[PDB]
Ligand binder design. Structure first.
Ligand SMILES: NC(=O)[C@H]1CCCN(C(=O)Cc2ccc(F)c(F)c2Br)C1
Ligand SMILES: [Zn+2]
Length: 139
């Protein structure tokens, strides 16, 4: 689990969004596994607007942060799960690192701010949903 709180927005994995997230919906995209809802309190996070390919992410299954080298946001095949049919997920960045079910929502950050959140994993890989192109989160 996990979320990004920026301005008056909360960014979460679409498959983990709550009844409250859907009742306060701003935008969602099933092909990206993202959902953004509105908040009454001002957020704690700031968003990176960069092309970094290295960063540090939080891994809840190890209660630890790990450094990673990750690919540019791209279209990647994701096998069927109880949350989605087999499909191509867009704006996804892969890296070698630990992840297991429960790790979605962990934040990836570079020196410029928040880059994205854990969205996929397995086999010694971890996938992050990029949020750097969502310029409206800042305004
Ligand atoms: N973005 C998706 O389609 C997600 C939806 C939930 C299910 N997805 C997973 O990847 C679950 C998973 C499996 C094995 C792992 F080792 C792991 F870390 C994770 Br997270 C795809
Ligand atoms: Zn950066």
């Amino acid at each position: 689990s996990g979320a990004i709180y920026v301005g008056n927005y909360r960014v979460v994995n679409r498959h983990l969004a709550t009844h409250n997230d859907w009742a306060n919906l701003v935008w969602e995209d099933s092909s990206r596994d993202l959902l953004v809802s509105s908040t009454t309190a001002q957020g704690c996070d700031t968003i990176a607007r960069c092309d970094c390919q290295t960063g540090v992410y939080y891994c809840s299954s190890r209660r630890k942060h790990y450094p990673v080298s990750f690919s540019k946001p791209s279209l990647i095949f994701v096998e069927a799960s109880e949350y989605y049919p087999a499909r191509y997920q867009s704006h996804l960045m892969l890296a070698v690192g630990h992840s297991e079910p429960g790790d979605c929502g962990g934040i990836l950050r570079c020196q410029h701010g928040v880059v994205g959140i854990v969205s996929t994993g397995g086999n010694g890989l971890v996938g992050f949903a990029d949020v750097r192109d969502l310029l409206w989160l800042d305004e």
